[PDB]
């Protein structure tokens, strides 16, 4: 592959020069024939397979702290690779295990927030044995993070898998989602997306309110066992009730979202490590909620009603009345937001924060890869500056994964 | 491997396996992905190509290597062979065009893809013979208002020192001017070819929107000026249907999106100049063209005439006089009775035809950066819609700009 690889931005001219793809480590799925980059989704390791890949994260690891190739460095090399041999694996030190979960959401090239990487409260979960401890863990996960609105980005991280019949997971894609209640006569009923796993809650014996915006029960597994339902105490789930600076009447639409943004499905790999059950949250852009959870079609799907609202023609497609109306809820979801001083960033200032940090990327690390189809955000594209930014694409680890959802894996007992 | 894609909104997946035809690279590899880069022969080269073109060719008719398809592979090769080229059958020439337009894997506007006009301009030799053939094009084309798909296609590259070319990116195209204090009139973009035109003897009107004069290269020679007549220039006053101040803020366009730099390859041969045109998918002014920074860059002004809170971002004031300026623009447009289309139309339009390709050819490759439009994304069906991207050929590709590379 070619040392430099150059990257363009057609609004401002600006030329970057990459050479941290030459790292990559992983396939992408694309090839010399074929490109996968709006493809969404493109057993243990063994003892052999496991020694390079954690001196590479060791070696990679003392390379930061500016102490390669020193005698803490060799030591660790040693401990490490001994543990390896004794034991089929190995336990990271906390300043290791740190240093992993921050470079793991440093390399996402998924996500346009990343210019907060360095900032992430790691909670070491590593000692959790049960569900019920499972439960308490993301509890004060919870409440941390949403700090009464002020929110701090964190993970809470569970032991790694072993032998892979015991892994720990949370079922929840994420820790906050309202329920999805598919009726007899095919309507639904709250969030469509969420009926399946709904319906396994259901099953596992919740009782559903079977309202518009039921905050789903967390469904969590320790050690390979059964998942246990919890309900997170509601009073930890921050919430904010959607109006408008200008209708009055769009808080009749009663419209809410939940504030904290928190991915619990993914796979952390850290130095071939796989930590299963890794919990991670941010702070939300605007579009997220406004646009895709609010006016997807096989989401709430608002966008009629806030048409019709607003008394707009609504017979040809060309009157553009769709784009209108999600201009104005996303106003009106920014706008809820911030009067609730619960944190929120635009997708103007969030893409442009990514460029900067994308230029330093480039400057002090030698790139910085970038899922253009993710990172451009979902409405107005192109008056953001991301859109115009070349990007190129790559997986460095330690990273986060994607892995099968675990109803379908599972071996009940 | 069969390949699946789905789309997220409908579930719906269908099946690629026309990839496995590619050839040709995409930039990418198994651990790089260049996805959003915008820019990723002798007797013995040309060959081969010409095989697979004309096989391909027959294949489509349903001759398959008939007495026909055989003399004609004969044919071919005694012509390379005698004078290092050959020249295409005017039945393969338009189906060689038609196939690169439906190969475009950045082109949303693909269902049509069948209905093209080609011009067969092979016998041109000079530009004053460019010029007249491209004064055709975009009156047929045009057809008043009721725009009609259509590509002119100019005598393909021999030697590399006598390439047809037409200079000028796109067909039409307003002039750029550099201001004393800073500022720039007109298309900021087109600053540097408007002041090649100038310094060729274009005398500029120095106006906001002056179509630019063409610029033809035939033959290898310097390139020659040429205005098109105006009466051939249809363009849109842009007024909105509320906004009563909009039509004050002095906007037009013109109706003829006609990309006249990209080089055609069919059967291994090289058409450097090959101008094609379509219509209007609405963004492209609304969004891009009016909006863009380094552009028209109208959204500040808009949004003050619109009385929009403009000090925070978080206002979304800049989408909302976006909203807006498309509007108006689809508004004119179909107010002038000149063909124009919504990019909700045109990504709807686009799934059915990738729906079609999917049944009758096992595939259809598509750039999903360039699909998407530039507005509004996931609420078109194309967000949602999983592409594969490969390179086929018969294709458009691009070619150095002309200017980088003559030999005055
Ligand atoms: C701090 C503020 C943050 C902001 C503003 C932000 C922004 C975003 C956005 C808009 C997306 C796309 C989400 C979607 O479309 O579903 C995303 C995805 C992602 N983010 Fe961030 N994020 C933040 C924090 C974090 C943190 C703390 C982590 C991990 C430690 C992280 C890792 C990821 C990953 C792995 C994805 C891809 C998710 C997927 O593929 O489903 N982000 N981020
Ligand atoms: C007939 C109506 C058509 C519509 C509505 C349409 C729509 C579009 C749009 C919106 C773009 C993006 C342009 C840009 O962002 O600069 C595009 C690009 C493109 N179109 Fe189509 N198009 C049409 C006809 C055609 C025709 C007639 C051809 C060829 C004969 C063609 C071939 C292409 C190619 C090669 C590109 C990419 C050009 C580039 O890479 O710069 N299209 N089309
Ligand atoms: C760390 C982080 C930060 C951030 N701003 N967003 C996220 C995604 C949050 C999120 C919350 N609920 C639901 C989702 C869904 C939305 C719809 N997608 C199809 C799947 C993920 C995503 C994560
Ligand atoms: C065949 C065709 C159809 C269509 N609807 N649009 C196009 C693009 C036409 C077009 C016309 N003038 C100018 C451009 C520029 C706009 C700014 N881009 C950065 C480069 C191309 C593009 C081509
Ligand atoms: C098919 C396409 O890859 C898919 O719809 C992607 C497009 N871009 C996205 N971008 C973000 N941020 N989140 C998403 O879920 C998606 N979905
Ligand atoms: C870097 C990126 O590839 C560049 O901005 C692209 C993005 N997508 C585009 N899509 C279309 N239709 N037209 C364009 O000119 C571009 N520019
Ligand atoms: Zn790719």
């Not at 906390?94 to 909670?123: M, P």
């Not at 940090?357 to 790139?367: A, D, I, K, L, S």
Request: aromatic share 12%; net charge neutral; charged share 25%.
């Amino acid at each position: 592959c070619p040392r430099f690889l150059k990257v363009k931005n057609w609004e401002t001219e600006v030329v970057l020069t990459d050479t941290l793809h030459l790292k990559s480590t992983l396939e992408t799925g694309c090839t010399e024939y074929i490109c996968m980059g709006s493809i969404m989704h493109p057993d243990v390791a063994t003892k052999d397979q496991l020694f390079p890949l954690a001196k590479e994260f060791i070696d990679q690891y003392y390379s930061s702290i500016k102490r390669f190739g020193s005698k803490a460095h060799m030591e660790r090399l040693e401990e490490v690779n001994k543990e390896i041999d004794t034991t089929s694996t190995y336990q990271l030190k906390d300043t290791e295990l740190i240093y992993g979960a921050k470079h793991a959401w440093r390399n996402a090239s998924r996500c346009v927030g990343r210019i907060q990487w360095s900032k992430l409260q790691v909670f070491d979960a590593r000692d959790c044995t049960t569900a019920h401890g499972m439960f308490n863990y993301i509890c004060n996960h919870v409440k941390y993070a949403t700090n009464k609105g002020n929110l701090r980005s964190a993970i809470t991280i569970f032991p790694q898998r072993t032998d892979g019949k015991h892994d720990f997971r949370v079922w929840n894609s994420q820790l906050i989602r309202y329920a999805g209640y598919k009726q007899p006569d095919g309507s639904t009923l709250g969030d469509p997306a969420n009926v399946q796993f709904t319906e396994i809650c259901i099953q596992q014996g919740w009782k559903p309110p079977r309202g518009r915006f039921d905050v789903l029960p967390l469904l969590l597994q320790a050690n390979g066992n059964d998942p246990e339902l919890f309900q997170i105490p509601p009073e930890l789930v921050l919430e904010v009730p959607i109006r408008h600076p200008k209708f009055e009447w769009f808080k009749d639409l009663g419209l809410k979202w939940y504030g904290l943004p928190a991915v619990s499905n993914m796979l952390l790999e850290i130095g071939g490590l796989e930590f299963s059950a890794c919990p991670f949250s941010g702070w939300y852009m605007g579009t997220e909620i406004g646009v895709r959870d609010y006016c997807d079609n096989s989401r709430y799907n608002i966008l009629e009603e806030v048409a019709k609202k607003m008394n707009l023609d609504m017979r040809k497609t060309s009157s553009l009345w769709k784009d209108q109306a999600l201009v104005e809820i996303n106003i009106a979801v920014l706008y809820s937001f911030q009067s609730d001083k619960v944190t929120i960033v635009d997708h103007h200032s969030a893409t442009e924060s990514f460029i900067k940090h994308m230029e330093n990327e480039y400057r002090c690390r030698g790139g910085c890869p970038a899922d253009w189809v993710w990172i451009v955000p979902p409405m107005s594209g192109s008056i953001t500056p991301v859109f115009h930014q070349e990007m190129l694409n790559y997986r460095l680890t330690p990273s986060f994964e994607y892995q099968p959802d675990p109803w379908n894996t599972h071996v009940w007992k």
